[PDB]
Chains A and B, each alone.
With several copies, the nearest count.
Chain A
Amino acid sequence: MEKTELIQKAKLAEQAERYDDMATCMKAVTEQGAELSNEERNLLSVAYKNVVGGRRSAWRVISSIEQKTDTSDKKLQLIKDYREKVESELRSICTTVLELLDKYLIANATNPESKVFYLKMKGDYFRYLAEVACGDDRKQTIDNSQGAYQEAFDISKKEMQPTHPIRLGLALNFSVFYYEILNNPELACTLAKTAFDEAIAELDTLNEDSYKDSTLIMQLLRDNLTLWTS
């Protein structure tokens, strides 16, 4: 198709909440081989987040039912096979996203804003893989998630400002990675708290537009902080 038409279709799919179509469009765009604008980059993120989010939600529900099911119940096997089907779909989506990030987005990124965004995305989708992994598979996926987040963190601290929404979002998801994946609430709180404080310090230097964008994410940081300190 044409990139212009793929993006129109993707915005239409987004409105209609047809995230499978939206993702297929943005994957086609990414395969055109050119760098994505901020708009297109956000379309790709929203599309695949919604596509994978449905599987994360389903996996959570099914896993909760499995856990509370008596280990001797002859109905447990079916619950387990269905959980594995959902896991298979989730791994397929994450693999598709990480493959795109590996062969196009990170490779051809020509500015630090995009590089931080794509590496953040790489950590996000290794994190989703770690949520469902076991054994050494879990170890390696966690290592890969941490690695991506860490490089995005270094670049964001070197090239961007503490109030930039992408940097605040990176801090948000990276802190969650420490809390849920590595089970280190102390480091998770320190990371979110540091990013939050460094942001309020420089809130002076923003118009009400960027102030709104940054403040919206900072509220999510302080929400996780409030939840974690209880």
Chain B
Amino acid sequence: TENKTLPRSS
């Protein structure tokens, strides 16, 4: 589980 950032790579 990674920390979520934006934008997100597809």
Residues of A that sit less than 8 Å from B by CB? 17, 19, 42, 45-46, 49-50, 53-54, 57, 124, 169, 172-173, 176, 179-180, 217, 220, 223-224, 227-228
Contacts and interface: CB of A to CB of B under 8 A. Distances in A.
Interface of B: 1, 3-10
Nearest to B3: A176
B3 A50 contact: no
14 contacts: A17-B10, A19-B10, A45-B7, A49-B7, A49-B9, A57-B9, A172-B5, A173-B5, A173-B6, A176-B5, A220-B4, A220-B5, A224-B3, A227-B3
A50 B10 contact: yes
A214 to B, nearest CB: 12
Contacts of B3: 176, 179-180, 224, 227-228
Contact of A227 (B1, B6, B7, B8): B1
Contacts of A45: 7
Contacts of B1: 227
B4 A124 contact: no
